[PDB]
Design an enzyme around this catalytic site. Structure first.
Site, PDB file in Angstrom:
ATOM      1  CG  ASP A   7      50.696  38.185 -31.196  1.00 42.71           C
ATOM      2  OD1 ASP A   7      49.919  38.484 -32.141  1.00 42.71           O
ATOM      3  OD2 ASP A   7      51.083  39.161 -30.328  1.00 42.71           O
ATOM      4  CG  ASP A 105      47.617  39.763 -34.319  1.00 35.83           C
ATOM      5  OD1 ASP A 105      46.683  39.851 -33.369  1.00 35.83           O
ATOM      6  OD2 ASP A 105      48.556  40.586 -34.250  1.00 35.83           O
ATOM      7  CD  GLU A 106      46.434  38.479 -29.491  1.00 34.59           C
ATOM      8  OE1 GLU A 106      47.067  39.388 -29.095  1.00 34.59           O
ATOM      9  OE2 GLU A 106      45.452  38.087 -28.934  1.00 34.59           O
TER      10      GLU A 106
HETATM   11  N1  LIG Z   1      43.052  50.976 -35.899  1.00 34.18           N
HETATM   12  C1  LIG Z   1      43.865  50.408 -34.868  1.00 34.18           C
HETATM   13  N2  LIG Z   1      44.405  48.955 -35.280  1.00 34.18           N
HETATM   14  C2  LIG Z   1      45.044  48.632 -34.233  1.00 34.18           C
HETATM   15  C3  LIG Z   1      45.349  49.214 -32.857  1.00 34.18           C
HETATM   16  N3  LIG Z   1      45.993  48.353 -32.082  1.00 34.18           N
HETATM   17  C4  LIG Z   1      46.263  47.395 -32.787  1.00 34.18           C
HETATM   18  N4  LIG Z   1      45.601  47.387 -34.321  1.00 34.18           N
HETATM   19  C5  LIG Z   1      46.091  46.255 -35.177  1.00 34.18           C
HETATM   20  C6  LIG Z   1      47.631  46.365 -34.809  1.00 34.18           C
HETATM   21  C7  LIG Z   1      48.200  45.147 -35.524  1.00 34.18           C
HETATM   22  O1  LIG Z   1      48.630  45.230 -36.871  1.00 34.18           O
HETATM   23  C8  LIG Z   1      47.064  44.263 -35.273  1.00 34.18           C
HETATM   24  C9  LIG Z   1      47.383  43.708 -33.884  1.00 34.18           C
HETATM   25  O2  LIG Z   1      48.482  42.958 -33.349  1.00 34.18           O
HETATM   26  P1  LIG Z   1      49.232  43.756 -31.881  1.00 34.18           P
HETATM   27  O3  LIG Z   1      48.749  43.022 -31.131  1.00 34.18           O
HETATM   28  O4  LIG Z   1      48.490  45.058 -32.469  1.00 34.18           O
HETATM   29  O5  LIG Z   1      50.618  43.531 -32.672  1.00 34.18           O
HETATM   30  P2  LIG Z   1      51.524  44.276 -33.765  1.00 34.18           P
HETATM   31  O6  LIG Z   1      51.418  43.455 -34.741  1.00 34.18           O
HETATM   32  O7  LIG Z   1      51.087  45.629 -34.120  1.00 34.18           O
HETATM   33  O8  LIG Z   1      52.597  44.191 -32.649  1.00 34.18           O
HETATM   34  P3  LIG Z   1      53.718  43.362 -32.640  1.00 34.18           P
HETATM   35  O9  LIG Z   1      53.342  42.182 -33.665  1.00 34.18           O
HETATM   36  O10 LIG Z   1      53.642  42.500 -31.337  1.00 34.18           O
HETATM   37  O11 LIG Z   1      55.046  43.724 -32.864  1.00 34.18           O
HETATM   38  O12 LIG Z   1      45.735  44.927 -34.746  1.00 34.18           O
HETATM   39  C10 LIG Z   1      44.751  50.396 -32.534  1.00 34.18           C
HETATM   40  O13 LIG Z   1      44.587  51.088 -31.545  1.00 34.18           O
HETATM   41  N5  LIG Z   1      43.870  50.947 -33.823  1.00 34.18           N
HETATM   42 CA   LIG Z   2      49.224  40.791 -28.859  1.00 33.63          CA
HETATM   43 CA   LIG Z   3      50.849  40.975 -32.943  1.00 36.54          CA
END
Ligand SMILES: Nc1nc2c(ncn2[C@H]2C[C@H](O)[C@@H](COP(=O)(O)OP(=O)(O)OP(=O)(O)O)O2)c(=O)[nH]1
Ligand SMILES: [Ca+2]
Ligand SMILES: [Ca+2]
Ligand SMILES: [Ca+2]
Length: 341
Positions: A7, A105-106
DNA sequence: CACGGAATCCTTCCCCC
DNA sequence: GGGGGAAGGATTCC
């Protein structure tokens, strides 16, 4: 049986840092501007400097600025993150033929063959982190366990930029210790229905008559939780295939007038078609977001594929069908194409 | 203030041997 | 009764 989950960290923001290193170190906010007004919209994600202050995925951009008025605010650029994702995915391929891409991203990797025990698995983890950091200059967290579910859980515990193994002795303590809500696939609605049934831990699902659990949360969901509790869950790693493409946009002003909505709707279909690229859908659904943020949809399956002319035509009727059966104004409108030939 | 996208399951028809 | 599907919505997660 060994599963390795990867991730990427604060992905959209980290990519923005890579493409412009001057950003590294400062709070970075990737936003989605709806255009209704100056800074209307939500935060897609934010780097850690920004998350330590409450700015995170979901919150309104306007609210994030009140907390960090001086952070860097950037518009989301999907295509750019998607291509970077694709390259990173291609690095993992070179680590297992068995690979399931879960999101942008996973990914899950079945390394039961390659590695022999957890020690090696861990090391392979470091090799992957290392490889990706070197090639793409992007950090990620790695989680390793007996099955997909615990591999992911392993990762949530080790982020950011960590790596963790949840060995068999731990699975057992987690099935007892770990809070049911922290289990993938259990959001608020479900956790809540679970509290009432006295279930606050995975184990509790065994001290409940299955049929009452199914009744309350659904069979699929009940069998899922139960197998996890019995330490028997073990779904394989398989390549997932895109099953639907769609696009939804916000209008500048809520409306009920067909002629005022059509433009937004047509643009939605257009973009959707560009994104289909070679794929041909048999089903089309029109999706509307009501002024009070409720979601309405009407669709149709054809005995053959849908041409763009057909999509324009049929989408107007479903939009008309929507307005005829719902009286609220519409805030967001879009289309969804599915059932590819 | 609340974006944009997609998978999967749950219900409720509805047709039909 | 139960197989087979299509619809419209619920729910989760990125
Ligand atoms: N437009 C939009 N994009 C989102 C939303 N939630 C997540 N994304 C995007 C955010 C991240 O850049 C990508 C998902 O990874 P998350 O699993 O969201 O991880 P993120 O990388 O932000 O968190 P982390 O690496 O664990 O610190 O998907 C949302 O509610 N709206
Ligand atoms: Ca995640
Ligand atoms: Ca992530
Ligand atoms: Ca949860």
């Amino acid at each position: 049986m060994i599963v390795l989950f990867v991730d990427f960290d604060y992905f959209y923001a980290q990519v923005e840092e890579v493409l412009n290193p001057s950003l590294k170190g400062k709070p970075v906010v990737v936003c989605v501007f709806s255009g209704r007004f100056e800074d209307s919209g939500a935060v897609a994600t934010a780097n850690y400097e920004a998350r330590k202050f409450g700015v995170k995925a979901g919150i309104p951009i306007v609210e994030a600025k009140k907390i960090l008025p001086n952070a860097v605010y950037l518009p989301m650029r999907k295509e750019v993150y998607q291509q970077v994702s694709s390259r990173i995915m291609n690095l993992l391929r070179e680590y297992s033929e068995k690979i399931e891409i879960a999101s942008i991203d996973e990914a899950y990797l079945d390394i039961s063959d390659k590695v022999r025990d957890y020690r090696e698995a861990y090391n392979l983890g470091l090799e992957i982190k290392n490889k990706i950091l070197e090639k793409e200059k992007i950090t990620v967290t790695v989680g390793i366990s007996k099955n997909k579910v615990f591999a992911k859980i392993a990762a949530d515990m080790a982020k950011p930029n960590g790596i963790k193994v949840i060995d068999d002795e731990e699975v057992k303590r987690l099935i007892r210790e770990l809070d049911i809500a922290d289990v993938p696939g259990i959001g608020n609605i479900t956790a809540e229905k679970l509290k009432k049934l006295g279930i606050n831990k995975l184990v509790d699902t065994l001290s409940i008559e299955f049929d009452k659990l199914k009744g309350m949360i659904g069979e699929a969901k009940a069998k899922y939780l139960i197998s996890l509790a019995r330490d028997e869950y073990n779904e394989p790693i398989r390549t997932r295939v895109r099953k639907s493409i769609g696009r939804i946009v916000t209008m500048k002003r809520n409306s009920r007038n067909l002629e005022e909505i059509k433009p937004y709707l047509f643009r939605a279909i257009e973009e959707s078609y560009y994104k289909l690229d070679k794929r041909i859908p048999k089903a089309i659904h029109v999706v509307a977001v009501t002024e009070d943020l409720d979601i309405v949809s009407r669709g149709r399956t054809f005995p053959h594929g849908i041409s763009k002319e057909t999509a324009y035509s049929e989408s107007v009727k479903l939009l008309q069908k929507i307005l005829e059966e719902d009286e609220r104004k519409i805030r967001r409108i879009g289309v969804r194409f599915s059932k590819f030939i």
